[PDB]
């Protein structure tokens, strides 16, 4: 018989979790960059 | 540079409709200028790509 | 077998508190959302060029109704009224009589397309594949009664669309 | 023959509720003609109120007239609160309906109905 | 798919994700519009013997509801079922 | 066959619009999980009951 | 959402009101190649939830 | 009878019969029948004076805890002199179980409103006022919920026709949507479908 | 161990659950003694209340008391004890151990008709 | 096999045509009466009668599962051909 079936080993794994990849600088580094831009502008 | 290949593909889309006249023909009728392989033409003049 | 959405107690050391304060004052998640919207700006859109490009369909598609014929010109409908008995909206009106050669044929086969719910119970009730719900969906009208099909309109739809309807049935009759 | 009441023990309390409902409709009718900006008069709307009360005047059951007072208060509550539109208020006045044949002869002329 | 690698790198950076491994636009990976003809299996009632309908008549094994008490000791108090077992927290991702 | 598929159930903690939002997003996650388990464990056989 | 309506239409013929799940089972079997495309959808839908 | 027959659940049948005996002997003042179907659902048919004492019990007893009102329903059976059958469907999340509390009324006898037991009922029995005309005494705001505001009659009564008595159209003379006595361009075609042969001999009624 | 949350919104954590359950169960038995002995509600509720009160008197740990009272969190066990108390106070005023107030009509529960 | 009434209106395969004094022809004024011009009673009469050597023939309409339900036509009468009740194809025993 011929029928819509999964393949011989089955389908591969499917991602289903959250992936919010945690990008960006730290809070210390972001305040340091902003204060450095302030000091450059003031100078 | 790959922007040059993009612009060459645009220029050969102009060439692919038989020049600027057929290019503007398909631009103002289809709102779309990309070229395809002509699959066929029916008994009315509709062309399939 | 369950999980707790939103049950994270946030860290209160100076690192994490300064991280949340930098997020508040420097708007980091707002730039994240702007970045995701910018990432869709440079994707190719999903827009097909209708009417020149068409949405994908299948041979099971339930569109405009049609009465079919045999490969001899004889119409398949033998007036058994199964389609109008199964019709969940009572769109089909059938009157029948024996015609001049004594065949069991209809004299009225009406489908009100404005009662029809397009569920195709008629084409699966039909024991001779006479009524089908064909592939046409582009048959909008300017008047309400142009959607009140009689037998002539359904037979003309069958004669018009048979070359496509027969190939769709050839694709799908083994699932039926 | 011993049934459970709704509000009224007998017809006296029932007629009291009918009488209070007629009072409330009589008071409401000019506000209804104003805020719905009806094209009728207060006399005409109060005559329609009187017609709707005297239509049900043959009833001798306290539970039935309790439910009639309940449904009349629901109509009034849907009229004071602007829940009806102008169309729902004017459905009491069958204006677009042609007058029915009342005698035997014109009912014979127009069709088969008794 | 036809995007250049500069726009692809910009796009992957702005999303923070690899967007070419999982395209939301479909290409040649999807199934063919013309398929081989199927051959569907038949059920367990497609037998030529020992296949009487009364031995598999589901609708005629339904009985009227058993009237437990009709109005024409130290027996244990009961509940409609045992009490529900407490759900276990997920081993997969409890968010804990 | 929900006794044969394996999935988690997102439980909120505050009863607000936000936890109900997170529950629906996580039910999309767990629905993808059930769809993977349904695609791998799809059996052969008929699709109507064989009582005609 | 549109691709899942294509899944409905491939399995029944209608994009929304399928009348496909019936008392007794389902009306018709899956067409060949449907489960592969449901796999190709499911493989990518987690990233759609991620960007939502 | 393996593949195509629904498998009978005897454990739930036994447990629901025992709990039905339990309810019938805790509340003999109101409980008239207790029955369990072959697909294992418990029906407690009570007197309409005990809507509040029974449903509070099932909501509050430590072996019942039916803290959820799933559905509230009326059923119009016109050959009964108490033609309306009020059906409560309750869910115990603690004991993972469902119970059905059925009672009766006619057009004129008010049922006591169960909003003090389950607030869920506040619209449901309100629907029973709108669809059936069953009055609920001590309801907070009893009025129509689903029909149009000028609607006369109660539609889910079985002597009420499928189409109404009135239909709407826009009338350009009065510049208004108006109601008129209903005329159909095609009458609804009544189909007499019932076979003249008996289908289920387990449900055969005794003759007169 | 001072459980921080019950998990259920609006159901606050009880600080002293054992003393609360003892007071609620003895108060249930106090109310429930005012019911006649032939009333099955009195017998069944005395039976289950004595079972719950003995389990509360025989377990110091809150978690193990939750696992062997078999009613979820301990605060919803407390809430169900309060619900049973309110029910017993209502069942006194209803007097539902009495005979049936009225027989149904003859074909009232006959389905199908 | 369409024909035409004296009003100039086409007569359908059923035989429906409005009268001259019928007002309901006004619906086709400025428009068209849509008839189908392939009359099935004329098309099935073009099919040649099938000569067979058996006494009973089966007919499913052609196409197997795509035709009609398979019926069995007796051919003992030599006065009359045996017609399929569904498809109208007619058969004759050649002896
Ligand atoms: C920045 C300013 C724009 C510079 C041009 C540009 O970035 O082009 C997009 C070009 C291609 O981007 P892509 O999305 O990866 O290409 C995929 C195409 O679908 C693949 O290209 P294609 O196969 O679709 O090629 C066809 C296309 C060819 O594409 C173009 O002609 C590109 C537009 C040129 C303007 O031609 C058309 O569709 C005709 C468009 C005609 C009007 C274009 C707009 C005119 C604006 C001024 C009036 O971008 C780059 O190559 C990266 C940016 C380079 C910037 C360099 C510094 C300037
Ligand atoms: C704008 C239009 C407004 C439409 C208003 C619709 C409101 C309709 C409310 C209807 C409520 C009733 O009909 S309750 C009346 C039923 N009462 C009875 O059957 C008892 C008999 N009642 C009567 O005879 C009444 O006239 C009186 C006033 C109670 C006593 O009069 P008799 O004495 O002399
Ligand atoms: S598709 Fe359904 S509603 Fe439409 S005519 Fe067929 S059976 Fe009737
Ligand atoms: S279309 Fe089919 S089901 Fe309907 S009357 Fe004709 S043969 Fe019968
Ligand atoms: Zn044939």
GROMACS .gro file of C-alpha atoms and ligand atoms in nm, chain B residues 3 6-7 9 13 23, chain E residues 2-4 6-7, ligand 1:
model
   69
   46UNK     CA    1   2.610   4.528  -0.636
   49UNK     CA    2   2.269   4.308  -0.924
   50UNK     CA    3   2.280   4.596  -1.171
   52UNK     CA    4   2.090   4.142  -1.370
   56UNK     CA    5   1.612   4.205  -1.740
   66UNK     CA    6   1.048   4.620  -2.080
  384UNK     CA    7   1.830   3.576  -0.416
  385UNK     CA    8   1.959   3.833  -0.168
  386UNK     CA    9   2.325   3.929  -0.183
  388UNK     CA   10   2.594   4.209   0.224
  389UNK     CA   11   2.216   4.242   0.268
  999LIG     C1   12   2.200   5.271  -0.108
  999LIG     C2   13   2.133   5.321  -0.234
  999LIG     C3   14   2.092   5.210  -0.329
  999LIG     C4   15   2.207   5.139  -0.397
  999LIG     C5   16   2.162   5.019  -0.480
  999LIG     C6   17   2.131   4.899  -0.396
  999LIG     O1   18   2.157   4.889  -0.279
  999LIG     O2   19   2.072   4.803  -0.467
  999LIG     C7   20   2.025   4.684  -0.398
  999LIG     C8   21   2.135   4.581  -0.390
  999LIG     C9   22   2.080   4.441  -0.397
  999LIG     O3   23   2.024   4.402  -0.271
  999LIG     P1   24   1.966   4.258  -0.243
  999LIG     O4   25   1.830   4.274  -0.179
  999LIG     O5   26   2.060   4.172  -0.170
  999LIG     O6   27   1.944   4.205  -0.393
  999LIG    C10   28   1.853   4.096  -0.415
  999LIG    C11   29   1.780   4.122  -0.544
  999LIG     O7   30   1.650   4.063  -0.537
  999LIG    C12   31   1.853   4.066  -0.663
  999LIG     O8   32   1.846   4.161  -0.770
  999LIG     P2   33   1.738   4.138  -0.887
  999LIG     O9   34   1.772   4.004  -0.950
  999LIG    O10   35   1.602   4.148  -0.832
  999LIG    O11   36   1.773   4.252  -0.997
  999LIG    C13   37   1.669   4.329  -1.060
  999LIG    C14   38   1.678   4.470  -1.007
  999LIG    C15   39   1.821   4.513  -0.995
  999LIG    O12   40   1.837   4.589  -0.873
  999LIG    C16   41   1.861   4.719  -0.884
  999LIG    O13   42   1.857   4.779  -0.988
  999LIG    C17   43   1.896   4.779  -0.751
  999LIG    C18   44   1.847   4.922  -0.732
  999LIG    C19   45   1.939   5.028  -0.792
  999LIG    C20   46   1.892   5.170  -0.767
  999LIG    O14   47   1.613   4.564  -1.098
  999LIG    C21   48   1.485   4.595  -1.076
  999LIG    O15   49   1.412   4.530  -1.007
  999LIG    C22   50   1.449   4.724  -1.142
  999LIG    C23   51   1.445   4.839  -1.042
  999LIG    C24   52   1.447   4.976  -1.106
  999LIG    C25   53   1.432   5.089  -1.005
  999LIG    C26   54   1.530   5.081  -0.890
  999LIG    C27   55   1.520   5.196  -0.792
  999LIG    C28   56   1.561   5.331  -0.849
  999LIG    C29   57   1.570   5.441  -0.746
  999LIG    C30   58   1.605   5.578  -0.804
  999LIG    C31   59   1.502   5.630  -0.902
  999LIG    O16   60   2.200   4.598  -0.260
  999LIG    C32   61   2.331   4.569  -0.252
  999LIG    O17   62   2.395   4.523  -0.343
  999LIG    C33   63   2.385   4.603  -0.116
  999LIG    C34   64   2.393   4.752  -0.089
  999LIG    C35   65   2.506   4.821  -0.164
  999LIG    C36   66   2.519   4.969  -0.132
  999LIG    C37   67   2.647   5.032  -0.185
  999LIG    C38   68   2.661   5.181  -0.156
  999LIG    C39   69   2.558   5.268  -0.225
   0.00000   0.00000   0.00000
